Coordinates of C-alpha atoms in Angstrom, one line a residue:
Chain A
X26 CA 260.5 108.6 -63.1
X27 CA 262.2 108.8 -59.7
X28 CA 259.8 106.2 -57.6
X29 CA 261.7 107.3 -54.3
X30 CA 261.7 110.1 -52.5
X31 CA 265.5 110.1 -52.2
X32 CA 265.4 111.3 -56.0
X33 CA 262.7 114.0 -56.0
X34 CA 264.5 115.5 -52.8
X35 CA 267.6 117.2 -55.5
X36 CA 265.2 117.6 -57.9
X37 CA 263.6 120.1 -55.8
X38 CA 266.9 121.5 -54.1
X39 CA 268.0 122.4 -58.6
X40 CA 264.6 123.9 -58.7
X41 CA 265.4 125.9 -55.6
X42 CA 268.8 126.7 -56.7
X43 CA 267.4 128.0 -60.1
X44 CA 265.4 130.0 -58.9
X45 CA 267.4 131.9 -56.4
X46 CA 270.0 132.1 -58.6
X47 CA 268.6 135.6 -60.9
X48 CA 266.0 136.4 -58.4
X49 CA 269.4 137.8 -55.8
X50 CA 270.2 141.3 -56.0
X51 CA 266.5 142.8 -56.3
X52 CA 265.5 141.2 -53.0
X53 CA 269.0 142.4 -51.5
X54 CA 267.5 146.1 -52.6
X55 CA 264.4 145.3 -51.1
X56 CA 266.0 143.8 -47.5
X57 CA 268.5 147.2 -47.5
X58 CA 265.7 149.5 -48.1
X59 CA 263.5 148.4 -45.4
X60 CA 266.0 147.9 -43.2
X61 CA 267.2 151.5 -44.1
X62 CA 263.5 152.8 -43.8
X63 CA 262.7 150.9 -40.5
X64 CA 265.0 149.5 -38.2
X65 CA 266.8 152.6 -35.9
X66 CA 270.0 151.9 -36.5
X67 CA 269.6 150.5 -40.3
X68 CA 271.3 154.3 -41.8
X69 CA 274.9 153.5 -41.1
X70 CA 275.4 149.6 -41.6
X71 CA 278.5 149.2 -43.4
X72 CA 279.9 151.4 -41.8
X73 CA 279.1 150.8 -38.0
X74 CA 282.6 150.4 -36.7
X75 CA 285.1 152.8 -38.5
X76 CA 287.2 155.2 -37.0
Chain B
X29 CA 286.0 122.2 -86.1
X30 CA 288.7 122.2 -83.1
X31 CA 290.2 125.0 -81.9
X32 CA 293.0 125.5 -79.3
X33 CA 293.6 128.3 -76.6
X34 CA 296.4 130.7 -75.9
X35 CA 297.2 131.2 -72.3
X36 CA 299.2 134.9 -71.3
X37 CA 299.6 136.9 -68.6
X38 CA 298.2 140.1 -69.4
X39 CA 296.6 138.8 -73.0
X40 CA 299.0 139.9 -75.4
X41 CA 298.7 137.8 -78.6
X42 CA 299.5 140.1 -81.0
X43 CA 302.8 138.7 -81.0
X44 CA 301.9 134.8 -81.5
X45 CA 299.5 133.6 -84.2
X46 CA 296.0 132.9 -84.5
X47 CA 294.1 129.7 -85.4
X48 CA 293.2 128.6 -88.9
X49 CA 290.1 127.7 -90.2
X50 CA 290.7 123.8 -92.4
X51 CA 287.6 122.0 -93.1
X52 CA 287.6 118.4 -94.1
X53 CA 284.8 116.5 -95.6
X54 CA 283.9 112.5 -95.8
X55 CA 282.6 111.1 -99.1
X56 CA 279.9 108.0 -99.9
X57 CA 280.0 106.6 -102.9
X58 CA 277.8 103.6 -104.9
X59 CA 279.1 100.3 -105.1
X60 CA 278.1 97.2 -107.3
X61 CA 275.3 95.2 -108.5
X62 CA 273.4 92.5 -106.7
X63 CA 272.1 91.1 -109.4
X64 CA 270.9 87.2 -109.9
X65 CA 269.2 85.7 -113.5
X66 CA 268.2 82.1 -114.3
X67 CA 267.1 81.3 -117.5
X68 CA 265.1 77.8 -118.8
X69 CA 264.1 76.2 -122.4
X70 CA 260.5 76.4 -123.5
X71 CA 260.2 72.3 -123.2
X72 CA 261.8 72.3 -120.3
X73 CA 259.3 74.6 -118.8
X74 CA 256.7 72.3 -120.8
X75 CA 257.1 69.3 -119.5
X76 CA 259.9 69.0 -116.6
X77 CA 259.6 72.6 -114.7
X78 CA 256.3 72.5 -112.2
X79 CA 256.4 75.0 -109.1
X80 CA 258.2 77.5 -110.4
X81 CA 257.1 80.3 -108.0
Chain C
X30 CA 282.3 150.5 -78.8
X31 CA 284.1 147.9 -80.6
X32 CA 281.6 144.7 -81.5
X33 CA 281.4 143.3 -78.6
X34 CA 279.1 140.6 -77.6
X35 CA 278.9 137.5 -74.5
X36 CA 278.1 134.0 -75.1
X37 CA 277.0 131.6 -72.6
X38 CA 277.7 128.0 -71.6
X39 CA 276.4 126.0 -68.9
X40 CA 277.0 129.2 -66.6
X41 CA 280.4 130.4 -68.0
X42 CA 280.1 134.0 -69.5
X43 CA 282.6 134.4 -72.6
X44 CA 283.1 137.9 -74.2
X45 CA 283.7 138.0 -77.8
X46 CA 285.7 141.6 -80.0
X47 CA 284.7 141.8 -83.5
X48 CA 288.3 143.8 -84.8
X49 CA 289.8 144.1 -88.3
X50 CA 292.4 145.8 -90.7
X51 CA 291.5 148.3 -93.0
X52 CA 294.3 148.1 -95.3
X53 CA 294.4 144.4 -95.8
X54 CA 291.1 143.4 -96.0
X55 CA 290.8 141.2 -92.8
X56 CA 288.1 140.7 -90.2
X57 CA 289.0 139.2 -86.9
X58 CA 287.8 137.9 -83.6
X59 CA 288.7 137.0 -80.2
X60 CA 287.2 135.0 -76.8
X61 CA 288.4 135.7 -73.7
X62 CA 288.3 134.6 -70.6
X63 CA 289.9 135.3 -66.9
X64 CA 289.7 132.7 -64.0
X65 CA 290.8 132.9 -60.3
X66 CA 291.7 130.3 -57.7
X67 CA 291.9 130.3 -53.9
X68 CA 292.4 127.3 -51.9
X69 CA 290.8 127.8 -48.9
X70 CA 292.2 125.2 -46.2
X71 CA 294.4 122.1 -47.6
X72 CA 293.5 120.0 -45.0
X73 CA 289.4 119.4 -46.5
X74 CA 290.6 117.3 -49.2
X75 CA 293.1 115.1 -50.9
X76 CA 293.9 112.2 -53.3
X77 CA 292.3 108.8 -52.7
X78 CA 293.2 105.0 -53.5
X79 CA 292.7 101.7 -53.5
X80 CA 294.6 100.1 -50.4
X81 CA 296.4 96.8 -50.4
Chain D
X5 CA 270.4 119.7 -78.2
X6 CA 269.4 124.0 -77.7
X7 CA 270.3 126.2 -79.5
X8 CA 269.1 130.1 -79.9
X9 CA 269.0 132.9 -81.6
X10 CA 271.4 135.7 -82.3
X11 CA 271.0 139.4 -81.8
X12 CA 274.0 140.6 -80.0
X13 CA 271.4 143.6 -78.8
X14 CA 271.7 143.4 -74.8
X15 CA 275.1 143.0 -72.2
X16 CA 275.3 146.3 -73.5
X17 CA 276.9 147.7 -69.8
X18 CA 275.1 145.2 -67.8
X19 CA 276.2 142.4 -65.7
X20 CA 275.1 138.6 -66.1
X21 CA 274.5 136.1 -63.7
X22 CA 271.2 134.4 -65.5
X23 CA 272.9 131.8 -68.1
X24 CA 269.9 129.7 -68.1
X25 CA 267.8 131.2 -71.0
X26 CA 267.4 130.2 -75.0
X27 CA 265.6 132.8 -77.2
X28 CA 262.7 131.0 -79.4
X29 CA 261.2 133.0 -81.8
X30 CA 257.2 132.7 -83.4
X31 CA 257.4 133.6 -87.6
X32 CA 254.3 135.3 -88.8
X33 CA 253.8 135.0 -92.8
X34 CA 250.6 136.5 -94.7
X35 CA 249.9 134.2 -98.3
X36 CA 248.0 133.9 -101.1
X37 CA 246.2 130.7 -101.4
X38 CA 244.1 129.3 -103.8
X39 CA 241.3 127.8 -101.9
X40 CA 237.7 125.9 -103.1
X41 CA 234.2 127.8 -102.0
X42 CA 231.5 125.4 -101.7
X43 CA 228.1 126.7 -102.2
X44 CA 225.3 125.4 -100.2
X45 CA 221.8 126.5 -101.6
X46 CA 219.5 125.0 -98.9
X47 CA 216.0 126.6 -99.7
X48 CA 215.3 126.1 -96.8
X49 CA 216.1 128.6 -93.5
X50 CA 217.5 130.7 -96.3
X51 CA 218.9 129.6 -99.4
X52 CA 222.6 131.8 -100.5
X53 CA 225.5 130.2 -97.9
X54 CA 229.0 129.8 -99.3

């Protein structure tokens, strides 16, 4: 029934953790491609410092 | 069931053997009567036996 | 293309072969798994006890 | 305890993270009952209702 606060606090830290857990790779996609689209320097990164 | 694990290398167990596959079962069975009886004469019950429920 | 198939337990992927022989009439299976350890920095952690 | 189904259909080439799912399934049937009609012949506000 967790009266205190103390116990709903990792409650909602598993409910975080489940749901980042699937929800991962399709943001990463969505981070890369607008950083790929938008930012000036965003077509090179993994590679910036090879040589 | 129970099983148990190999552990290799590279997983080879075509050498080695596999588990097998024993089942085991646990039986009930019925057990005796419980069983009570009185018995009375009839002037018994006709004069002397009163309450008898 | 051999059966194939993964089963899951509290977050542990298993995968499972479906194989057999022909010749002698026997179906088989097998589970496998492969782990991997590091140990990052040994001095983050220890044994513990009850002192005198 | 949980316990679901079997199909061995998908992980066919695809990687799992997400372990956290059990597969419940609905069951449609279609029957034939034998059932009572009850016949109410109200003259009144029309008369024929089953």
């Amino acid at each position: 029934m967790a009266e205190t606060l103390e116990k709903k606090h990792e409650r909602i830290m598993l409910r975080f953790d489940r749901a980042y857990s699937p929800q991962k790779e399709v943001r990463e996609k969505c981070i890369e491609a607008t950083r790929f689209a938008r930012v000036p320097g965003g077509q090179w990164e993994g590679a910036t410092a090879a040589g | 069931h129970q099983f148990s694990s190999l552990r290799t290398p590279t997983g080879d167990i075509s050498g080695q053997n596999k588990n097998n596959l024993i089942s085991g079962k646990a039986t009930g069975r019925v057990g005796n009567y419980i069983t009570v009886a009185v018995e009375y004469q009839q002037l018994e019950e006709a004069i002397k036996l009163n309450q008898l429920e | 293309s051999i059966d194939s198939a993964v089963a899951t337990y509290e977050g542990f992927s298993i995968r499972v072969h479906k194989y057999a022989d022909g010749d002698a009439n026997v179906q088989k299976m097998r589970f496998d798994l492969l782990p991997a350890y590091v140990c990052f920095n040994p001095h983050m952690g220890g044994q513990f006890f009850g002192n005198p | 305890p949980t316990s679901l189904d079997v199909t061995s259909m998908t992980s066919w080439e695809y990687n799992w993270f997400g372990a956290d799912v059990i597969y419940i399934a609905k069951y449609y049937e279609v029957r034939k009952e034998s059932v009572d009609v009850i016949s109410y012949r109200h003259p009144i506000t029309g008369e024929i209702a089953t």
